[PDB]
Swiss-Prot record:
Disorder named in the UniProt entry: TMEM63B defects may be a cause of neurodevelomental disorder, characterized by severe early-onset developmental and epileptic encephalopathy (DEE), intellectual disability, and severe motor and cortical visual impairment associated with progressive neurodegenerative brain changes.
Residue positions the entry lists as glycosylated: 353
Any GO molecular function: mechanosensitive monoatomic cation channel activity
Compartmental location: Cell membrane; Endoplasmic reticulum membrane; Lysosome membrane; Early endosome membrane
UniProt effect for mutating residue 354 to I: Found in patients with neurodevelomental disorder; constitutive phospholipid scramblase activity
Record GO biological process: drinking behavior; exocytosis; intestinal stem cell homeostasis; sensory perception of sound; surfactant secretion
Catalytically driven reaction(s): Ca(2+)(in) = Ca(2+)(out); Mg(2+)(in) = Mg(2+)(out); K(+)(in) = K(+)(out); Na(+)(in) = Na(+)(out)
Keywords assigned: Calcium, Cell membrane, Endoplasmic reticulum, Endosome, Exocytosis, Glycoprotein, Hearing, Ion channel, Ion transport, Lipoprotein, Lysosome, Membrane, Palmitate, Phosphoprotein, Transmembrane, Transmembrane helix, Transport
Listed name of the protein: Mechanosensitive cation channel TMEM63B
Record's comment on post-translational modification: Palmitoylation is required for localization to the plasma membrane and stability. N-Glycosylated.
Amino acid sequence: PKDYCYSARIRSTVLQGLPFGGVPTVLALDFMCFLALLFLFSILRKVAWDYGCSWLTAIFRIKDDEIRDKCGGDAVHYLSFQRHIIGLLVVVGVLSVGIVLPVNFSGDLLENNAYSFGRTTIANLKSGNNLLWLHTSFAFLYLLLTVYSMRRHTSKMRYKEDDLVKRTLFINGISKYAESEKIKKHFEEAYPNCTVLEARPCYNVARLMFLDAERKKAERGKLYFTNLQSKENEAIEYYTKLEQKLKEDYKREKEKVNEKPLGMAFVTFHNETITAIILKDFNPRPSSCSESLHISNWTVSYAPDPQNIYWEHLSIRGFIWWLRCLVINVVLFILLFFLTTPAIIITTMDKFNVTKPVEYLNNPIITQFFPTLLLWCFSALLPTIVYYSAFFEAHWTRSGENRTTMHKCYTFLIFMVLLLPSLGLSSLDLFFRWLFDKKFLAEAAIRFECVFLPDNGAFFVNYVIASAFIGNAMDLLRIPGLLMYMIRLCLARSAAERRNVKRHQAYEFQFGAAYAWMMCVFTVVMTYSITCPIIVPFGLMYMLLKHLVDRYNLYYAYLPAKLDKKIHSGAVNQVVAAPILCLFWLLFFSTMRTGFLAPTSMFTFVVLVITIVICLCHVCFGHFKYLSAHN
């Protein structure tokens, strides 16, 4: 009827957007780049045939037994994770395209434009429609399909925590000048059965291994330059002098490291049961040395592996560590904002100045391919920046450091591509509709019925696409061995020394980065599955390509990792978190379209309230009937 939704017969309503949302054009430019990036990997594969198109046949000519044997259980767990996500995405893609998309096409909100992409999006749905319940029901159902699927995935692993570690205790808050003997005697006195094997109070070690690592680097530099001089017949003098200064500083400090106690100690116990008794009582029993020790100010927890602990980063503790962490997070947040602004700005540079014709709509390359490529480049470079930031964070235990880097990279990535872009597009679409009354209109307010997105969600379809046919291809080119390109232009002869640079390799295939990036794209796909269902077909291709490229990378170009078990539990937590974001964004867009007074918004808010509260209490109660069922 008179759908009033940017009817082109009046003003031509430049806000419409490019026909077909510019999907096909980006489905070629990067796709051609796909059949250009793959081909290039070949040329580079010639580097492998310099003593240190067959990749296509080699990718498919592998089996599960060999990858299980060579790269261990971590790689096979990661591959099973990918396989289960691909299965879940197959189910949604069949389900969403099967049922959601024809429901979306039904109704007349953008049908007045034949080529408009919004017909497939949720924007085509009326203000009040009974079948819109499906939209706010299916998403809920998907959440179940995300719990069950990972339930089928989290029930295919073993212990990895045989002893579960109950030997030593990492205690913080001990009185600074307390000696080991006092705390030992206190431990004997406080508990009935106690045999303290060893109690070591940590000292401010930092400067010692700072200067020692500098000395070691100077030593290896001097040795390398002396070996080079011995062969070819001032680096040696400068390195020597640096070594002498570093050794002098090392002895000078070693004479004074002991005058810096941290008030933090490790205690070793003969039996595990006594450790269990001690931890419970602290989560205390007095002794003759209790008052002087300031026991009430202590913190007692399971001591991690000695190889797992950053000794040098132990000194930074208390409030100042938290302040430094917050400052680092804020600076990274600001950089995140300054990197995500250009994509939105370039995409919506056309849509400003509504008083313009449709023909002013730029080429789909300019508004929906270049912004997408820039966003993908920033998002792929983001893991490097976030990891690099972890060194300047003082996070103590390494196992905790990897977990927090994976989670932080996931959060920044999901802010880079989903949260900030979606909120920004909603903001500079509400501005547009609010600017869609002064030109030629008489209504006193926005009808709030076509306010979905400036391009009706086609931007994120282009983001998923350009992360499949370009992200995976560049992932395949991100093999340690890319440093085998610039060498070609650096000289024309001396073949021998180039391949020595190749011999470095030996990256452990940091799993958080792959997990975080996959979780980012999966979060985009699942959040926009219910409102822009055409995205799910393009997520299946992404996950299939990621699976194949990562299998090739693991079995041919990556060292075995042997990562902590907790990383995979974090990853399954993220997988469950994705449909939660989908439900939240469904609630947000239903609120914008109709508001809380609609029954659909009430339904989805009730579902979100139910899901969140039972997810929060999982960390405290857990029990059965919910996910993370590793056995």
